[PDB]
Subunit: 136 residues, 6 copies
Amino acid sequence: NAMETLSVIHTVANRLRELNPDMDIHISSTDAKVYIPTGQQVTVLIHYCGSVFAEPENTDATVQKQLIRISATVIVPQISDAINALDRLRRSLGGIELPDCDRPLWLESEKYIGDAANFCRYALDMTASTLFIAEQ
Amino acid sequence: NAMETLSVIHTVANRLRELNPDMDIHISSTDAKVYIPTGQQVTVLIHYCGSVFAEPENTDATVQKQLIRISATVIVPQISDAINALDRLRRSLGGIELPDCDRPLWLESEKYIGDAANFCRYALDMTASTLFIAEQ
Amino acid sequence: NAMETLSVIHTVANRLRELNPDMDIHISSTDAKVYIPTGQQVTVLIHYCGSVFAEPENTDATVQKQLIRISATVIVPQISDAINALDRLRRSLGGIELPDCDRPLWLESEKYIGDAANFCRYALDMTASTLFIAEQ
Amino acid sequence: NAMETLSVIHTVANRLRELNPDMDIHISSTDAKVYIPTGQQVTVLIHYCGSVFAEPENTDATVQKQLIRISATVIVPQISDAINALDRLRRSLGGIELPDCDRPLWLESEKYIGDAANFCRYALDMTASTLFIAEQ
Amino acid sequence: NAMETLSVIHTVANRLRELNPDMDIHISSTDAKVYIPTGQQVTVLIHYCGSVFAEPENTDATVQKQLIRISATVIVPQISDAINALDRLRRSLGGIELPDCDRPLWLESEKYIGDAANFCRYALDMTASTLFIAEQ
Amino acid sequence: NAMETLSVIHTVANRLRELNPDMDIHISSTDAKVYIPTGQQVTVLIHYCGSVFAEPENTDATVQKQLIRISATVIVPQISDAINALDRLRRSLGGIELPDCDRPLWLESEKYIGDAANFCRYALDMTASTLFIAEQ
Ligand SMILES: [Ca+2]
Ligand SMILES: [Ca+2]
Ligand SMILES: [Ca+2]
Ligand SMILES: [Ca+2]
Ligand SMILES: [Ca+2]
Ligand SMILES: [Ca+2]
Ligand SMILES: [Ca+2]
Ligand SMILES: [Ca+2]
Ligand SMILES: [Cl-]
Ligand SMILES: [Cl-]
Ligand SMILES: [Cl-]
Ligand SMILES: [Cl-]
Ligand SMILES: [Cl-]
Ligand SMILES: [Cl-]
C-alpha cells in the first residue's frame, strides 16, 4: 500500500495522545509560531513540512525515494514547562513505526520558535521515509 | 518535433482534470502564495517555473539538455483537505508521459507554502526533461 | 577585433526582429520587470546583464576569458501567450553566431520575472563567450 | 538515565551563580537581544537554542547522537564590563561536567549581539553532547 | 616600497582621464548606485571596495598577500551609451601597471547596478595585487 | 596565563595611539557605522567582533583553539583621508604581538562601511589567536 500523508500525521498525533493523555494535540491550519492554545493543558501542534523526492535510481520504472518532514511544536507559558514537554515528545516519538514507511521515525532537530503572546514555543523536527511508486 | 512549453503544462492540467473532476484547475498569473480562490471547490494552480539548460557537450552542434520545472499548488481552507489534495496530485501526475520530453514526469518536492487569507497552500514541484536543438 | 558588447546585443535584437516581424523589440533603460508596453504587439526587452572575467591563464600576456550574460524578456498580457512567446525566442536565438565571440550563443535559463501592471513577464537568459585582450 | 534538558540548563545557571555571586543570572522567555535589566549588576540570560540529531549509524536500533546548543548572554551598560564578564563566563563554564552528557561542556563561539536600550550584549554559545536512545 | 592604496586609485583615475577626455571621472564619497550628475556627459565614479589578506604562508615573517578590489561605475542617461562606455573602461584599464603592485590590473566582472534618477549604471570590478609586509 | 580579551583590545588601541598621536582612538559601544565624531581628528573605533573556538583535538582535556576577531574602523569626512588612515592602521597593526596570544596579529580584510552623516568609513578586520584552557 502507498503511504497516505495524513495517516502518517495522525499516527504521530495519536501516539502522542496515548502516551500523554493530558496534552492537547492538534493538527492545525495555523502556524505554531502564533497559534494560541485554549485549553488548560500543555499544547502540541503537529505539522507536515513537506518532502524531497530523489530521482529514480537508473530504473525503467518511475519509483522515487521520499524523505518526509514533520514537526511537533510545544506551546506553553513557562520556559521550563516547554523544555520538559519537549523531552516528552522525543521520548514518545523517536523510533516509532509509521504506516507504509520503510524505517522508523527519526529525530532531526529541535529549535526555538518564539514566545509570541506569552507562550514559549519549541519545535521537534522529524523525518520519515517511504517509496513513491507511480501508476502504470 | 521541438517541445512546446504550453503543450506540456496543458498535458499536466488535463491529466489532473480528468482524474480529479471536483477540482478547479487554473493556469494563472497570480502567485499561488497569495491567490484567493473564488468559490468553495478545491483549487489547484499549475505554474511553469522555468528551465535550466546544460551546456552543449563538446560537440559541433548546439544541442542542450533542458530541465523543466513545473509546480502544482493546492489552495484550500482546511489543512487536512490540503494534504489529501496533495496526495491526489501526486498519484495523478507522477511518472506520466509528456509530449516531446525525454523521460516521464518526475516528482521533485512537496512544500508548505503558507496560510495567506486563511487558505492552506501546498505545492508539488515537478520536473520534465527535453533536448533543445538549435536551428542550422 | 575586440568584442563590442553593444554589437552583440544588437545581433540578438536584429535576429529577433527578422524572425518575429510582429514583435516589438527594445533595448531599453527600464527594467523588464516594470516596463509597460505602449502597444498591443508582443514585447521583448533585451538587456546586458554583465560579464564575469576569468583570470589570465598565467602567461606573459594579459588575456582573460569573458562570459557575457544577456536576457530577453517577453512582456505580454496573458500567461499562455507569454509562454508561447518564450518558445519563439529560444528557437530564434539558440545557437546563433555572435560577432567577435569564440562560440555560438548558448541558452542558460528561463525564469518567471513577474506580472506587474497586468503584463506577464518571462526571461530567457543566454550566454556568449569571448577573449578579452589587454593593450600593451 | 536519559538526559533532562532543563537539568543541563540548571547546571550551567547554578555553576554561574556560585562562581559569580555579583551576577544576576536568568533563564528567561525574553530574547537576550531586547531584555532590559532591572538593576545595576551584570545580567546573564541562559537559553536553550536547540539540538541536532545525527542519523542512527547503520544500526537496527534507533540510537541518535545529539548535539545541544546553549547560550549565555551578558547584558551590561558599558562594553569594557561586558567583555570582562564574557571572560568570566568562559572561565566558569568551559570544560564543565554536565548531567547525563557523554563529554564536558564545550565552547563554540562568542558574538556581539547589539546595544539595545543602551546595554552592550555579547553571547557565549556552547555545546553539550548526549546519546538519544529510542524506547523499543 | 609599501603600496599606498590612494596611489592605486589615482593611477586608475588618471589613466581613465587620459584615454577618455570626454568622460567625467570622480573619486566620490557618494555611492554610484545613487549619485546624480548634473548634465548628461559620461560620468565615472572610482571607488576602493576593500581588500582580502591571505594568511602568512607559515614562515618566519608576517608577509600577507593582498587582493585589492576597485570599482569603476559608468553613470550615463542612455543604456547604449552606458555599454559603449563600459567597453571603453575595460580597454583603458585591463592590464595596466599599478604602483607597488606585483602584477597588472585584472578585470573581475561587469554588473548592472540600476537606473536611478534616469541614469543607467554599470560597474566594472577589477582586482589588483600586492604584498603586505609587516613592520617590526 | 589566560588570555584577557579587553587587554588584547587595549594593546591594539595603545599601539595605535603610540604610532598615530593625531588620531582619536576609541573603544565605543556605538557601531562604527553610525558613530558621529566631534572634532577634526581622524577617529578610529576598535571593536571586539567575537571568537570561534575549535573542538578539543582528540584529547581528554578541554583545550580549545580560539580565533579572535577585532575591527578597527576609520571615520573621516574625506574619502582620500580615510584611505590614507586605513594605510596607517594596517602599517601600525599588522604582525604586532598580543598578550597571551600564540602568534602575531594578522590582517584579515578591509571593507568599505558607508558614508553616514557625511563621514567616510572603512574598517580593517584582524585576527588574533590564542589557546583556551579550561579549569580543572
Ligand atoms: Ca485527554
Ligand atoms: Ca540516471
Ligand atoms: Ca468539474
Ligand atoms: Ca515589424
Ligand atoms: Ca548575588
Ligand atoms: Ca601621462
Ligand atoms: Ca574633458
Ligand atoms: Ca610602549
Ligand atoms: Cl500528559
Ligand atoms: Cl475530484
Ligand atoms: Cl512575429
Ligand atoms: Cl561576581
Ligand atoms: Cl572620451
Ligand atoms: Cl598621527
